[PDB]
Amino acid sequence: WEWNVTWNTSNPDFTKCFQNTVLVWVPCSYLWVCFPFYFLYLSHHDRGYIQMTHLNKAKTALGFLLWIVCWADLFYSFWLAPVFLVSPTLLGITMLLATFLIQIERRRGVQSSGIMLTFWLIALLCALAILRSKIMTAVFRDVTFYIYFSLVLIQLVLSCFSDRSPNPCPESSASFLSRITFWWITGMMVQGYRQPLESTDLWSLNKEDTSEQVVPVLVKNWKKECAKSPSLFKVLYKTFGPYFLMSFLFKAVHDLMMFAGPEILKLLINFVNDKKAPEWQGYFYTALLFISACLQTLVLHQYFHICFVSGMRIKTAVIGAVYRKALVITNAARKSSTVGEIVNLMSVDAQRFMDLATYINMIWSAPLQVILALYLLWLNLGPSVLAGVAVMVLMVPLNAVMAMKTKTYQVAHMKSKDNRIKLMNEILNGIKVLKLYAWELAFKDKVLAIRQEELKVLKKSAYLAAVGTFTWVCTPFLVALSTFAVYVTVDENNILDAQKAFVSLALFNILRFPLNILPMVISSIVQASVSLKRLRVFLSHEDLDPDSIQRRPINSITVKNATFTWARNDPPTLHGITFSVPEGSLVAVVGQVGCGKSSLLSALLAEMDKVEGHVTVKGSVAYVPQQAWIQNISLRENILFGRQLQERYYKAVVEACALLPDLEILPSGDRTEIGEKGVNLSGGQKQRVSLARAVYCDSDVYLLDDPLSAVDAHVGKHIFENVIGPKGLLKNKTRLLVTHAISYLPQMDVIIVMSGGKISEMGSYQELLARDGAFAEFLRTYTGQVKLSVYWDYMKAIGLFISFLSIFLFLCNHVASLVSNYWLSLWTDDPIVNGTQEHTQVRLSVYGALGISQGITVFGYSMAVSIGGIFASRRLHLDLLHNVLRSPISFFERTPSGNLVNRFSKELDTVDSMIPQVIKMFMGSLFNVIGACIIILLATPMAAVIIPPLGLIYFFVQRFYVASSRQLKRLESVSRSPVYSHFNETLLGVSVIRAFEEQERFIRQSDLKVDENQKAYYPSIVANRWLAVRLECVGNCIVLFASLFAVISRHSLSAGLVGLSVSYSLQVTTYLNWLVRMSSEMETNIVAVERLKEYSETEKEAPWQIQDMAPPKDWPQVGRVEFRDYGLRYDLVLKHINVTIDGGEKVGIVGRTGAGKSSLTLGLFRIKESAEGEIIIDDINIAKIGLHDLRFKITIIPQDPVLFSGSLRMNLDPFSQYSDEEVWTSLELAHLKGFVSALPDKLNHECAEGGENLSVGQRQLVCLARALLRKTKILVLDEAETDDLIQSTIRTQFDDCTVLTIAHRLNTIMDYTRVIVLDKGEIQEWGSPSDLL
Ligand SMILES: CC[C@]1(O)C[C@@H]2CN(CCc3c([nH]c4ccccc34)[C@@](C(=O)OC)(c3cc4c(cc3OC)N(C=O)[C@H]3[C@@](O)(C(=O)OC)[C@H](OC(C)=O)[C@]5(CC)C=CCN6CC[C@]43[C@@H]65)C2)C1
Ligand SMILES: CC[C@]1(O)C[C@@H]2CN(CCc3c([nH]c4ccccc34)[C@@](C(=O)OC)(c3cc4c(cc3OC)N(C=O)[C@H]3[C@@](O)(C(=O)OC)[C@H](OC(C)=O)[C@]5(CC)C=CCN6CC[C@]43[C@@H]65)C2)C1
Ligand SMILES: N[C@@H](CCC(=O)N[C@@H](CS)C(=O)NCC(=O)O)C(=O)O
């Protein structure tokens, strides 16, 4: 090895000894170090054995022949040089290891072998180098090498094809090349462009990615850890750590390869410096740069794939284990953890684990990258690098402090947003009463105040985000300027050549990311630490005793000397209970409140903690809980409960529970979506469903914990007759019922009466009555791409001046960056005379000036984008609120309240906290690309020939990525919510699930939902990897072309220009993809703006204030109402209405369901526009008057009074227009002075959502107080205990005012003269009740 023939000569030939030693030791050596390690994977991971195919044999036969040929050399050598013995033997032996390896790979079922392929690629390159040398030298030993090379080439070609296998995910069947360069998802991207993607188009999860695979492994490892009485981290890295080990390896390789880049750039700069260097050296350097960049791309995205897959495995396993634990944990643990905390364990903790696994390897990669970059910068610049290190040491803690303060601001913003969302939910749930009361402006002002607090904290967060963008963008320049200034100023002979400038710039750009992610990674580790503590606490919770009850398959229920607890430390709730319930007997638990009736049924289900005794419940148990648990599935599936539908049995169960009227009122019948999310049901209906579900399940033992609490007396008696009674559906079933109603007690076979959780003289009804003891005492007790129009809409919401100022500032920022780097290039070209550079302080001053301009302009554009985002969020929230409050009631009835809430929640978030940062990221990911391309084209104009082709590539790739990514993302977005929702359901009805033994069915359902979520999430991240690989190699193909054109025209190019072009190309690589990912984020984020502005063109209500035809104060002077040919369409509910209500004349409206009674009040308040009608109050038409005016001059007491959160005074007078004396007088006149004076907060009593603290009677009297305080001449009443009080109060002082009354009860309407009867909208009778009869 000497430099004359290998590097100095125009023919780069390797020496003969080098050829025969190192070029042969490289490939053989690769297989020798990998072979042992590869058994780990081959053994731990198995997939069967592949059959005998021609391909596998072809490879094995060529491996045999190749070994022979290599040993044939040893034979000829045996037939002087020491290398002519060891090298052929070694090659033969490693070849024998290669053929054995494909053999064992066949045995272990691997279709594509990364090792064999790479190994053959390295062998091929080594053979190619020797081949070229041997063909340039020119029989004896050469022909053996030609045979070796041809066989190696054919072996390499064979190794690319995938062998036979031993809507699935194509990742498995994918070849090694298809796996490293993600190609099995190309079909998904093309399909997503051509057709919309649905959940039916998504591939089935990998068998190792499925919940049924990952969750049991974690559960087993947790069981092992808990048996060794517990570290959840130990379990986590014992279960997923093995798989994550490869990411660590890939992470290291990427770090080394990414530092190779600046070294090769240094070599290229040195090559351009000397004009006597052979050109092949420059082509070798650019090939090395291209190869290292492409390798770094591959290993990096393989590392990312491993990290993301491991994060999935962790999230799925954690979710499954949490679900199973919740299915097994005891009542004390559930009481400790509430409900939202457990769902938080299922959502935020598992998501934190996944997001952490994405970047946790940085906790070591970032320090190692920093150390390596600092050492290379030292090698370049001496001790002058300490200035840049000092700048970094200043900036990184600054970034951490700003991140902590941003977290504080986000906590405050979340609190204020939750307040706003609560207020908006109460506004939407009660918008009818708001519009009827003309209260839209007051609640608008309330929401605006909450949003003002939210916008203040958002503005502070925006200031912080702008400073953070400034620091992140301008820290590389600060480091470069500090190190360059110190370098040139400490020593006059410190020459700043291109080698010491642009290589150092590349090193600073390498340093930029790790420094910025290290604080974030440490914060993520701390958050994952607290989340891991929460998960470990939940998974260490006490498990319920499964055998607490004997659960004997088919004296039916046996309890002897059994005492139960609700907690180990807590005293017993049921002391010394004994009773035997025979098969097919009706037993009623009897007691007072807090006696221990429900505790008995909980104890029979192994929900109580049994401190002593023996319970032997025989056969299946159907539990009807006191608090009805309703699944969000349809009512039919609620009753079925995952059971085969039997039409006769179902249709016998539904009416026996008297569920037929409930089915009739509900829109879709039994297919209606009952539950919290769907249609809400009354308590009695929920008890009916629960009882119907229990009856359909057809158990032998029934535990009915007060099934008839909320059903009415007639409905309850009917239910008992057809279901629970001896002549009902459950005649032969053992029914244990908890009741406090005597009506059905004589029909009960056995009455278990207890007191204070103790058995107290149980027996039959007649015998217990005869005994005259405790029972007698008890009885005596009583699509396409988002349009540019919405981008322009967001730009206008920001403000055209702010948006265009930010665009100008960003353009100035990158112009300054480009000019600063060009100035550095000119600086590096400064000649050396007398050992120094003449122009240093001028160059340094201009570099610093350009950097200061860049910094102030970066701060400027970050400020402009951040502030414009605040402005846009304010404008969009105001417009959305105004449009919502102006839209008619029909709009709220039509549109589900879910999407209306999803406009003020999430969508505002996307607009205010996400869109500005995505805009900032896109601007950079775009102008970094533009500046790099401009620099490359200006330095090497010929590089314009590769801009079109690669650009075309970019186009197509971007297209497919975008056209699929959003779809995948939206699929992911629709899959995450059900899982937690399901968990919530499982947390609410865990007692029901345990009693019905449906734990496995719900575990499978949770596995399904998670698997659907992961089936949406996996294609998304693999899409990210696909886009990256393609466009990063595209950017790396440019790096190649930029360096190649630099070496082609090196004689007319300076070293500074070459270094500049190559450095800028090195980074355009890390951005062409981020440019697309950010374009996709823009497309998927601007839709939020589109959904915010969608109620802007819908039909709105008539103007609230006309101000041209406004009425005079006291417009209803007497309140003379006249319906002149009124017609209202909800075809016409109201028709031919010609009635006249005189001023101060009491008038009521009677009619059956389906008449226009209520719709008539909607006519008075103009809720629905008059299809044909001229309602006139006194001498003024209603339709001409603005809405607010009439809504203020007419008052209405609706069916269910809606009390809004806040003080009582804000309920009575939201505008605070009426004085305190008027409020006090009205409250006293409303029979409420005694109660209202009782609250410690006086008039400022904080009533919760809907006035839950207040009683129904009180809320009704508060609504009456509102109407009384209004002091208007026209009042409407909507009637459904306190009825005597509200009726007397409406009859007390409102005799002066004209009162319309719609009552479903004839008793009250009889008092009012002039009754109007509505048959089907027509006026059936118009006269006084005396003329009625
Ligand atoms: C409110 C502060 C905030 O939270 C910080 C910051 C940005 N957040 C929004 C959240 C977010 C981040 N990534 C995302 C990718 C897609 C969608 C959202 C995000 C990011 C993150 O990873 O969070 C975990 C992040 C971003 C960049 C970043 C380092 C960084 O995390 C340490 N880089 C600086 O170090 C920039 C970058 O150019 C770089 O590193 O250049 C050397 C980076 O490109 C590469 C090759 O990585 C990237 C990535 C999108 C590409 C385009 C240009 N832009 C500029 C910023 C940068 C980014 C968190 C907001
Ligand atoms: C694959 C799709 C996508 O890439 C995922 C997801 C969103 N992306 C858009 C890219 C993006 C992200 N951040 C940004 C910040 C500015 C500009 C762009 C982005 C984010 C990211 O940082 O990527 C690296 C991200 C976002 C949120 C997120 C977790 C998350 O990534 C870990 N949340 C969970 O923590 C949400 C959040 O509300 C929350 O805490 O919810 C309980 C979160 O609030 C906090 C305190 O963090 C935040 C952050 C801005 C606040 C406002 C409301 N929104 C809702 C989503 C959330 C975010 C990437 C699209
Ligand atoms: N050079 C960086 C590259 C990491 C990188 O690409 N940056 C972020 C993006 S901010 C990332 O990890 N991307 C993951 C993704 O594709 O979501 C390293 O040291 O790994």
UniProtKB/Swiss-Prot annotation:
Protein family: Belongs to the ABC transporter superfamily. ABCC family. Conjugate transporter (TC 3.A.1.208) subfamily.
Listed InterPro entries: AAA+_ATPase (IPR003593), ABC1_TM_dom (IPR011527), ABC1_TM_sf (IPR036640), ABC_transporter-like_ATP-bd (IPR003439), ABC_transporter-like_CS (IPR017871), ABC_transporter_C-like (IPR050173), MRP (IPR005292), P-loop_NTPase (IPR027417)
Residue positions where N6-succinyllysine is found in the record: 422
Residue positions binding ATP 1: 591-598
Signal peptide: none
Compartment(s) where it occurs, according to its Swiss-Prot or TrEMBL record: Cell membrane; Basolateral cell membrane
Residues the record marks as carrying a glycan: 4, 834
Residues annotated as domain ABC transmembrane type-1: 244-527, 803-1084
Any single Pfam family the record assigns to this protein: TMD0_ABC
Species, as recorded: Bos taurus
Protein function: Mediates export of organic anions and drugs from the cytoplasm. Mediates ATP-dependent transport of glutathione and glutathione conjugates, leukotriene C4, estradiol-17-beta-o-glucuronide, methotrexate, antiviral drugs and other xenobiotics. Confers resistance to anticancer drugs by decreasing accumulation of drug in cells, and by mediating ATP- and GSH-dependent drug export. Hydrolyzes ATP with low efficiency. Catalyzes the export of sphingosine 1-phosphate from mast cells independently of their degranulation.
Broad class of the protein's primary localization: membrane
Stretches in topological domain Extracellular: 257-282, 381-383, 488-509, 817-853, 939, 1053-1054
Keyword Endoplasmic reticulum on entry: no
Residues at which ATP 2 binds: 1151-1158
Presence of the UniProt keyword Repressor in the record: no
Name of this chain's protein: Multidrug resistance-associated protein 1
EC id: 7.6.2.2, 7.6.2.3
Entry superkingdom: Eukaryota
Activity regulation remarks: MK 571 inhibits sphingosine 1-phosphate and leukotriene C4 export.
Bilayer topology term: Multi-pass membrane protein
